[PDB]
């Protein structure tokens, strides 16, 4: 399983070059978010009020994407329904503050519903 992996490496490199060439704002967001550790747990849906789960790795990333109950991702707005920490405990939106950020068990998992696009 050596040549196969070189072929696989080559296919993925060509894949992302096409993605880079596409220069789409929504595609760039999910690719760039994943590089920062903000990755989806399920397929990003397209129906209004459809469930999305994403890993959010740190507070700097959280502040860049979430404002109040609104999550911005893939050029769409998502209303956050649940936040859990690495212990699967519910984090109330009030505790996710700049002042309280070191007391949380990062990374967090956000469960949001699709709403504006």
């Amino acid at each position: 399983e050596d040549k196969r992996a070189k072929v696989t490496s080559a296919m993925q490199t060509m894949l992302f070059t096409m993605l880079r060439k596409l220069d789409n704002d929504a595609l760039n967001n999910i690719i760039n978010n994943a590089r920062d550790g903000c990755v989806p747990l399920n397929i990003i849906p397209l129906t209004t009020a459809a469930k999305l789960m994403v890993v959010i790795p740190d507070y700097n990333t959280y502040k860049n994407t979430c404002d109040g109950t609104t999550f911005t991702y893939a050029s769409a707005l998502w209303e956050i329904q649940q936040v859990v920490d690495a212990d699967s405990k519910i984090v109330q939106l009030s505790e996710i503050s700049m002042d309280n950020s070191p007391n949380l068990a990062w990374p967090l998992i956000v469960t949001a519903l699709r709403a504006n696009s």
């Binding site: 490496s9 070059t17 596409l22 595609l27 999910i30 994943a34 399920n42 397929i43 397209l46």
Partner: protein, 81 residues
């Protein structure tokens, strides 16, 4: 136009998912196939890109199936190969 580039990219992406042995998951693969076909049959770029967001999200949701940092390191080190 750019309409063509998104459909072309979706065939490669499904093929990338092919190599990653996704077909074992007969629901994910069926879901991947449905998304890929919808992009090729799409009539405006909005559908191609929206369906592509979902289809690409499959690769991104696969923990360690790709190492995006590892891959992006390669492009910058290649710098036009």
């Amino acid at each position: 136009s750019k309409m063509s580039d998104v459909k072309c990219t979706s065939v490669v992406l499904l093929s990338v998912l092919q190599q990653l042995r996704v077909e074992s998951s007969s629901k994910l693969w069926a879901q991947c196939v449905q998304l890929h076909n919808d992009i090729l049959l799409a009539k405006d770029t909005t559908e191609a890109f929206e369906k592509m967001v979902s289809l690409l999200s499959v690769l991104l949701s696969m923990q360690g199936a790709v190492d995006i940092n590892k891959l992006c390191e390669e492009m910058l080190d290649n710098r036009a190969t």
